[PDB]
Design a protein around this ligand. Structure first.
Ligand SMILES: O=P(O)(O)C(O)(Cc1cccnc1)P(=O)(O)O
Ligand SMILES: O=P(O)(O)C(O)(Cc1cccnc1)P(=O)(O)O
Ligand SMILES: [Mg+2]
Ligand SMILES: [Mg+2]
Ligand SMILES: [Mg+2]
Ligand SMILES: [Mg+2]
Ligand SMILES: [Mg+2]
Ligand SMILES: [Mg+2]
Lengths: 331, 335
């Protein structure tokens, strides 16, 4: 898909950030800050905004530029969340490049989160002249609910669980995942798209596709979690960082009372032994039947969308995310 | 002014906060001591302080258009929103600056760690955002969009002001040291400390249409902002001797710029070489030159220009609010 000239609007997006910086060295700093954190990447979430904006809306106005801007606002929102995540999680690299807090220091990274946010806020606020109040208003409500949940989701990510009390530690996983990841990644860009378009209207037909974004997000984080276990070797990984994650969630689900003991002990000092078990528990295997069932259930759900115009972009959506996750390091 | 009713709204605000945080249905909500984490966060960060800016907004809003009932609570609420804004800004500032105490108590980042401190900042940001969206039902959309525009402008200026505050490259030969500082300070302090609550206050009061010399008020709040920060800086030079402070941190300070207007080529080497290495020695030159001296001259002219400016306000009603403001600020600075 393209998505071109969504990417190419970056140029025009930079100029709008540049002209907002009439306050009146710092411009150069923050222009580079957005180049480092917003320019880099696949831009999946800003891409979800254009897709949904696509069949849903009918060619009338030059809101298209405005839709692209908002597609870059979502990218700055994603970026600022990740610069904040890499600090807490002692991240080393992201998007093939050292984390912003490493190149620029922690104090500047914290302040820079504040920059992107207010930038985000300001570019939104100035979409009133294009879609008017109602649209902007409905867009700002989505924004608030999205990040609010991500923060609480992130809080749960920081809040240590009770490994011994693993009766519904899985219930704590998915809930957390819905909070921290699922919302901003999927709910936010889509609902931002649904608004700009003003699709007409299937409101009662909104929970279904809501259940779609909940699984898309679950699926996204679940695979994120396995990759770390599968390819990260360090003392600043999920296990060495004592984090509630899909492999540990499942392990406690599949393991005898003798292996869950070996994991509770070494979590998390020796990540070595924790993974040893994951292999004898064949977690990797279990994620594959997940990945498998994840796909078709989304198709099940997709096949039920009534609009038949909303189902088109949601057909691309399911594809785009699954291709992201299955066309990885395969071997 | 018997600011007491506002302070007593805290319970309703906290009720309004607890009521929102209903995030999970279906289940018994076994995973919600999250609420008890953040209720504690609010008690720890927003309840403490002395609550100045909050007061400023309520004072303003009520004084240029007094509410009689109902809208008052939405003014009190916002004033508590203001407070949660200032708190989140200072939690971030204390991390960046390695602070130890705030509002009497130990810094939130120390107590709960900086991974949580950063997350908790944007809890308060997002709550404040969603709470300011609350007023829509009471004041209307055009009044909310105006609030939001003020919120944005103000925190955005502070963010770039904090960047200039963190600015690593502060060279030797600097003539713009006073320009870089007073601008820095305009951006990081002047905007949000007194502009934000006063421009919140008088959006809610919505009175009146004075547009021409409504710059005059901005010229007062600026002076008041830098006035407040210049004190903060002096106080740092005077009242601590920790193993590491504002000079151990190469921070652009008031005792540093007005020390580069009076000193000599030779003394401009003492301060330069020992900055971020030995506060004592750097404090001795300050001492020689007597920074607290010319700081007194500063306050005099600062209150002189301030008072003369307030004599020019068009509304004798606003004028008194502004005189009262500056009086409460000057004194409070003198605590
Ligand atoms: O990419 P990362 O850092 O593995 C992660 O997925 C990024 C992230 C941050 C915030 C919300 N959701 C996911 P995390 O959750 O920190 O494991
Ligand atoms: O109270 P502090 O930390 O002395 C200070 O005034 C707090 C502060 C932070 C942000 C804006 N204005 C003041 P700083 O500026 O860090 O010296
Ligand atoms: Mg991470
Ligand atoms: Mg994490
Ligand atoms: Mg991960
Ligand atoms: Mg400080
Ligand atoms: Mg500071
Ligand atoms: Mg200070």
């Amino acid at each position: 898909y393209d998505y071109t000239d969504f990417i190419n609007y970056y140029d025009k997006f930079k100029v709008i950030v540049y002209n907002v910086l009439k306050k009146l060295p710092v411009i150069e700093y923050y222009l580079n800050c957005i180049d480092y954190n917003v320019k880099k990447g696949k831009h999946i979430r800003g891409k979800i905004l254009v897709l949904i904006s696509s069949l849903s809306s009918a060619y009338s106005n030059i809101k298209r530029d405005s839709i692209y801007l908002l597609g870059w606002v979502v990218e700055a929102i994603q970026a600022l969340i990740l610069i904040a995540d890499d600090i807490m999680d002692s991240g080393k690299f992201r998007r093939g490049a050292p984390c912003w807090y490493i190149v620029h220091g922690q104090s500047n990274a914290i302040n820079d989160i504040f920059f992107l946010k207010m930038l985000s806020l300001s570019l939104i606020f100035e979409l009133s002249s294009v879609f008017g109040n109602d649209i902007v208003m409905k867009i700002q409500k989505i924004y608030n609910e999205s990040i609010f949940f991500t923060v609480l989701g992130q809080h749960l990510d920081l809040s240590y669980f009770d490994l011994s009390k693993a009766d519904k530690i899985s219930e704590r996983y998915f809930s957390m995942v819905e909070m921290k990841t699922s919302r901003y990644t999927f709910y936010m860009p889509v609902f931002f798209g649904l608004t700009l378009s003003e699709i007409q209207v299937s409101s009662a037909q909104l929970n279904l596709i809501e259940a779609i974004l909940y699984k898309l997000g679950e699926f996204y984080q679940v695979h994120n979690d396995v990759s770390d276990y599968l390819f990260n070797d360090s003392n600043a990984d999920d296990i060495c960082r004592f984090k509630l994650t899909w492999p540990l969630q499942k392990s406690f689900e599949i393991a005898d009372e003798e292996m869950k003991l070996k994991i509770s002990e070494n979590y998390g000092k020796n990540s070595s032994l924790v993974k040893d078990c994951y292999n004898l528990l064949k977690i990797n295997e279990h994620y594959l039947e997940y990945q498998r069932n994840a796909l078709d259930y989304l198709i099940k759900l997709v096949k039920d969308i009534t609009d038949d115009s909303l189902q088109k972009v949601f057909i691309h959506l399911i594809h785009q995310i699954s291709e992201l996750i299955t066309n990885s390091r395969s071997n």
